[PDB]
Design a binder for this molecule. Sequence first.
Ligand SMILES: [Cl-]
Length: 215
Amino acid sequence: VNSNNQAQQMAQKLDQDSIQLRNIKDNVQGTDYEKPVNEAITSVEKLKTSLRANSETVYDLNSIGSRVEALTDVIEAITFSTQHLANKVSQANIDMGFGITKLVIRILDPFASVDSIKAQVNDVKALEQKVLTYPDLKPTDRATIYTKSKLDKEIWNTRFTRDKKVLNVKEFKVYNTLNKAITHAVGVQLNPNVTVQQVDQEIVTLQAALQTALK
Ligand SMILES: [Cl-]
């Protein structure tokens, strides 16, 4: 039947989202997208269980498909935040994370019609372009968790190059001094009062400490 073959497409699509959403689950820790993607991962499992429970009944796959498709719009909205909203004020990610929450709720809602799901997907897309016009953070403004995402990635990038180019290559005192700057950068990341400027200088200071250990 043309319904069973269609069922394994969405089942394989839900596995693509399950892998894509667990990757995102780490990067959105402690942000406005932590609970939304946790609800999205749960939505992936309840759709799989529903598809698997009705495997050989051959029924209407319209509502189950609109929920699977809306998960791609959920993922697309999250990657849109990572690439375009890191310099925005807190309200941009707050308002947009609220919209993704409203979308995942409809995906989970058994009473949500296909129209109400598709209408909410457009709400998210319209919300994406709207938060783009939000003001950027001044260099003197307090740093948000999204501002410290670059410092967080720089700490793990310096940790990777340290264990590959410094650990067993240079003397221990070089390893010790570089580990002091990594620990110091973690203190800046954990400081709720550092500015956007102080996060930028800490990235350069840690990068300078890595080239110091690599000379
Ligand atoms: Cl912070």
